[PDB]
Amino acid sequence: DDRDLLLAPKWISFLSLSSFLKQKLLSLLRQIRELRLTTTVYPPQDKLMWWSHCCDPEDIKVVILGQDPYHKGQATGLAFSVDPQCQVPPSLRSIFRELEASVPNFSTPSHGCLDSWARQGVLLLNTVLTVEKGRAGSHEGLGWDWFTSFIISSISSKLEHCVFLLWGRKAIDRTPLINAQKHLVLTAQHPSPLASLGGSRWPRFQGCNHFNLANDYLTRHRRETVDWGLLEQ
C-alpha cells in the first residue's frame, strides 16, 4: 500500500514505481523496522523520506548527495543537515566556510538546520539512508543503492537544467546516472577536511565555488536561484 512507502504522494506519482519496486521498498523498510528492535538506527523511520516532504519534484533546482546519515543522533533525514540540538559536525562547518568565502549574502549561522535549503528546491539526498549508531557506512551496499540511484535517474530523466553537486568518491560514483546534456554536474573533493583527492582525480572542495556556479547555471537557463544565505533556526 502507498501509505507505507513513507514518500509524499507528489513523489510517489513522480517516481512512478512499479509494483515490484514498491514491494521491494516495503520489504526494505520492514527489514529496518525489525532491525530497530535490536539496534539503534539513524535517522528515525519517519524521517527516511524527509526530503520528499520539504519540496515537490518540480521544485528541484540543485541536487546535493550525501553518503550515509550521521551516526551520533544528529541526522534529520536530510543530507548534511543537523538537528538544532547538536553541534555542527566537520563536514557542514567546511561547507559553511566555502559559502562564507564565496557568496556575498551568506553569513555562517550558529546552527546547522538546512530546511530552508530544502524548501527552495535543494535536494539533500543521502546515497544510503540509514546507519547503525556509531558505525559509519554500516548500511552501505545494495540495500539502499538501487533506491537512491532510482531517484537520481528519475530526476535526470524527467527534469531539466538542474545542478548536481558531487562531493567525494561515493557521490562522484553516481556520475553515470546523470545526463550531462540536460544537467550541470560539478565535482569536488569531499568537504570534510583532508578528504581524498582522487587516487582518480577531482578538484579541491576549498575554492570550488559550487554554489555560485550552480546559480550562474540556473540564471543562464532562466530558473530561480538558490539563496544559500537563508538558513532559519
Author numbering: 21 to 219, 222 to 255
What did the authors write?
Efficient γ-herpesvirus lytic phase replication requires a virally encoded UNG-type uracil-DNA glycosylase as a structural element of the viral replisome. Uniquely, γ-herpesvirus UNGs carry a seven or eight residue insertion of variable sequence in the otherwise highly conserved minor-groove DNA binding loop. The UNG leucine loop is a conserved structural feature which is responsible for widening the DNA minor groove and flipping pyrimidines out of the base stack and, in the case of uracil, into the UNG active site for catalysis. kUNG, in common with other known UNGs, comprises a single C-terminal globular domain made up of a four-stranded parallel β-sheet flanked by six α-helices, with an additional left-handed coil of three helices at the N-terminus.
